């Protein structure tokens with residue numbers, strides 16, 4: 001009878017097994033223990049069956065050391081790195097090839113005529129590049145590129161598919177840009193296969209703008225510079241410097257961006273675009289001869305200075321661009337009358353030369369990263385472990401689940417609270433809430449008559465009306481709060497000096513959802529009304545012990561009121577001579593008035609001890625004249641306020657003296673046959689309420705332990721499952737700086753594997 | 767029929783548990799009457815009154 005919710009769950013839980021254990025045992029334990037093992041061993045078979053078919057498309061199985069997915073290893077390493085750390089602290093050490101040049105140059109053309117002319121939005125009229133776009137190029141058949149690493153199935157040779165693919169990239173480009181600028185560092189990941197593509201990662205960084213026009217947000221050019229740090233602070237970056245062939249080199253921006261990155265040109269190759277505009281204006285090949293020699297290019301870029309040319313139409317196909325480029329370069333005086341042989345100028349030579357320089361840098365510098373990340377992990381683990389010796393290995397998934405079980409365990413522990421605590425806490429809390437209402441609004445005005453029948457009649461009518469409207473509504477609220485008060489203590493209270501504060505955000509977050517769903521039984525009040533009516537209706541106290549308990553607790557309530565009034569009075573009247581002379585204090589003129597106003601009222605009560613609480617205006621006038629006769633002029637309102645506090649002090653002392661004789665007078669045996677005027681009807685009123693609330697608490701406790709705590713437990717389970725799926729809150733709640741460090745350690749460990757996997761793939765040559 | 771077959775078996779356990787809890791308390795408070803009915807109660811009075 002102490003608790004019934006736990007028994008119900010066990011009974012039906014066994015029933016479920018009795019009917020379905022022959023299916024549950026296989027699914028719940030046998031399958032799950034084998035499930036993890038088969039992931040390593042049997043999924044291996046299905047992965048290999050498809051992988052081999054995919055490798056045949058790659059040709060990796062057919063040809064040793066030659067596989068189109070071999071270059072995809074390089075991108076996988078960077079994809080983890082960008083997710084692990086997209087900031088300069090990690091990005092600055094990641095090898096890459098970047099397209100750098102004046103925005104007007106159309107610098108991206110170096111990549112458009114390879115694969116991107118079909119799927120990347122282009123054309124003049126507006127700035128196209130909005131954020132770094134990385135394209136993973138690989139020798140292979142035509143295949144729809146990955147867009148934001150998402151799979152696609154499109155034909156790259158038909159306009160209808162390509163147009164939709166151009167839309168997809170544009171959406172990422174603009175969405176990466178936030179208010180205040182037109183460019184964003186947030187990168188876009190593309191991976192395309194097709195003929196003529198080289199194994200390398202080329203990034204089209206947003207074009208630099210000398211000045212921010214009114215058509216662009218003010219921070220455009222500063223943002224591009226910060227994005228330009230992808231190479232300016234990256235010793236592993238290869239820079240393709242694009243000179244806008246429409247304008248002279250002395251008008252360029254790229255010269256300063258790269259010359260401050262590598263003034264020796266060791267990390268860069270200079271490329272020129274739109275050279276054919278030289279013949280749409282008065283061509284000056286003598287300036288081109290300086291261009292090839294790098295006289296006017298401070299970065300002294302190394303390699304052959306390739307040139308890109310195009311019809312300028314934004315619909316020219318990749319094949320059309322290649323054919324146009326070859327014919328123009330092989331005949332134009334810009335290159336035929338200067339030392340720029342077309343077979344070195346052609347973009348396809350740049351792609352090969354860029355691919356050649358790409359693998360040179362990657363193999364040389366990649367091994368340094370493996371040592372760097374390993375050193376990082378050891379330094380992080382040493383400090384992380386020393387500050388958190390308890391957690392040698394931690395994850396945010398492990399952190400959440402521990403709380404999930406811990407929370408459910410505590411709420412169950414809350415369900416283990418004995419009724420003794422519930423009944424005492426509910427009874428004590430509820431009575432204290434309504435202890436003054438009865439005294440001030442029911443008892444004291446009823447005490448103004450000497451007719452005990454009216455006294456009991458008056459209160460009973462008020463109580464029944466009060467009972468119907470207030471008592472069960474306050475009682476449930478106390479019970480609802482009382483359960484939450486213990487729940488919070490069970491939930492988030494520390495175990496002395498040991499406490500995992502890392503879990504407090506989730507615990508309180510779970511509570512708020514669980515209390516919102518904690519709807520107390522809407523009919524609990526109806527039972528209490530019947531109970532309270534019966535508890536009040538039965539006023540028969542035939543037991544001395546019932547009398548003894550009721551009177552002592554009534555005294556405490558009255559003594560509390562007496563001190564409450566007395567403390568208010570002392571402030572109203574101030575210190576007496578004992579404290580005025582002891583602490584060198586004095587009275588305010590109001591306190592002086594109150595003391596004399598008090599004295600006159602005390603004298604009035606000294607004789608008229610039975611004076612009713614209500615004062616006649618003649619008494620108010622009498623006091624005023626009695627005080628005015630001593631030089632004290634008092635507003636009637638002061639007297640009435642003084643009167644109320646002093647009267648209760650007078651009354652309450654009388655009531656306690658009545659209580660003293662009620663217990664003592666009846667206690668003496670020979671006095672029980674003396675019918676004195678000591679009808680302790682207040683003890684009858686107090687006793688019934690004490691019993692009435694005690695029964696109320698028991699009804700609340702029964703509902704508390706039978707229905708409400710189970711609803712609280714059920715809601716917690718519903719909320720915790722929502723949190724289990726709510727990754728963002730789990731991240732937002734689990735921010736303890738050790739799980740985040742543990743998360744970083746995991747990512748560092750993964751990168752070390754990914755770094756070595758690619759490095760291991762480099763070592764396939766020997 | 768999906769809901770009825772799934773949940774109906776729970777009722778059988780619930781009612782059986784109800785009877786055992788009711789019989790335990792009912793029998794303990796009324797050990798004399800292991801089985802009682804309002805028809806048996808009336809007839810006993812009928813004979814008792816006539817006697």
Ligand SMILES: Nc1nc2c(ncn2[C@@H]2O[C@H](COP(=O)(O)OP(=O)(O)O)[C@@H](O)[C@H]2O)c(=O)[nH]1
Pocket residue numbers: 103104105106107108109110112121122123124128129273274275276277308309310311312313314315316
């Ligand atoms: N004349 C000429 N036009 C080009 C060349 N490369 C690209 N374009 C034109 O520039 C426009 C878009 O090229 P794109 O590489 O996207 O430059 P961006 O949009 O300014 O970054 C298209 O209309 C192309 O025809 C080139 O080498 N010569």
Ligand code: ALF
Pocket residue numbers: 102103104105106107108126127128129205206207
């Ligand atoms: F014109 Al650009 F990136 F070269 F938008």
Ligand SMILES: [K+]
Pocket residue numbers: 103104105106123124125126127128
């Ligand atoms: K442009």
Ligand SMILES: [Mg+2]
Pocket residue numbers: 108122128129
């Ligand atoms: Mg562009």
